[PDB]
């Protein structure tokens, strides 16, 4: 997260860290056994780390659970990143409490101007790499579809939306992929891509979760 602030320990209880010997992507806990992340974060050997604040120190509240299976959306296109969503089923259910809790899926899509909270352990530099130990937060609004398409002509599908600041300076970045975009207590987006990080007129692009609620429910119901 570039231009964000320290969230504060366990103030984002649905945030998870996907780990393979190091933190490589974020995710959101949606129930005690399932996590939603981005398809481009897929790899084998994933350990899901819940209740984290400092990812380099065991401070208490952490729950490390292996993923039993990862389900990348069948229509995921790695070239366009269209349908960049994946579901991860945990080997055992997580113990939910105040520090580890699930986030609700939306019942409707959000409008432009909605303010959302984006969090993660991704790079904090737009020009260089600096990875933080604790979780960073950023409040960002959803932009209009016209501003988004104007910024990324020909690259935005109906399953994506832009959120951020056209002036640059505040944005999600590499390492934040797969993490949550929460607006009014509902998971509306998944950190997906962007051109560089926090560049002027190049806002972040997110997977539009409201387009996938039935798919998520049907897939969880059959696995
Ligand atoms: N500007 C943003 N809002 C943004 C958001 C998520 C991103 N995720 C990534 C991302 C980038 C890589 C690098 C690979 C590298 O430099 O080593 C790449 O360009 O392909 C890899 C992953 Br996986 C990302 O999620 N860039 C991102 C940029
Ligand atoms: Ca820790
Ligand atoms: Cl277009």
Swiss-Prot record:
Binds 1 Ca(2+) ion per subunit. GO terms for cellular component: extracellular space; serine protease inhibitor complex. The active site is at residues 40, 84, 177. GO terms for molecular function: endopeptidase activity; metal ion binding; serine-type endopeptidase activity; serpin family protein binding. Is inhibited by scorpion cyclotide trypsin inhibitor TopI1. It holds the Pfam family Trypsin. Disulfide bonds join 7-137, 25-41, 109-210, 116-183, 148-162, 173-197. It is an enzyme of class 3 (hydrolase). Its EC number is 3.4.21.4. Its cofactor is Ca(2+). It catalyses: Preferential cleavage: Arg-|-Xaa, Lys-|-Xaa. Keywords: Calcium, Digestion, Disulfide bond, Hydrolase, Metal-binding, Protease, Secreted, Serine protease, Signal, Zymogen. Residues 1-221 form the Peptidase S1 domain. It comes from the Eukaryota. Belongs to the peptidase S1 family. This is Serine protease 1. The lineage of its organism: Eukaryota, Metazoa, Chordata, Craniata, Vertebrata. The gene is PRSS1.
């Amino acid at each position: 997260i570039v231009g964000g602030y320290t969230c504060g320990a366990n103030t984002v209880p649905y945030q998870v860290s996907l780990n393979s010997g190091y933190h490589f992507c974020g995710g959101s806990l949606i129930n005690s056994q399932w996590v939603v992340s981005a398809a481009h974060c897929y790899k084998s050997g994933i350990q899901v780390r819940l209740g984290e604040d400092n990812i380099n120190v065991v401070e208490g509240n952490e729950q490390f659970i292996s993923a039993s299976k990862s389900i990348v959306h069948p229509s995921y296109n790695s070239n366009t990143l269209n349908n960049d969503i994946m579901l991860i089923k945990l080997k055992s259910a997580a113990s939910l409490n105040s520090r580890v809790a699930s986030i609700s899926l939306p019942t409707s899509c959000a409008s432009a101007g909605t303010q959302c909270l984006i969090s993660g352990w991704g790079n904090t530099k737009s020009s260089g790499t600096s990875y933080p130990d604790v979780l960073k937060c950023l409040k960002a609004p959803i932009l209009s579809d016209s501003s988004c398409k104007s910024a990324y002509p020909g690259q935005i599908t109906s399953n994506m939306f832009c959120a951020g600041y056209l002036e640059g300076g505040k944005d999600s970045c590499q390492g934040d992929s797969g993490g949550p975009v929460v607006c009014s207590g509902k998971l509306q987006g998944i950190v997906s891509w962007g051109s560089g990080c926090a560049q002027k007129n190049k806002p972040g692009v997110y997977t539009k979760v409201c387009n996938y609620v039935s798919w998520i429910k049907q897939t969880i119901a059959s696995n």
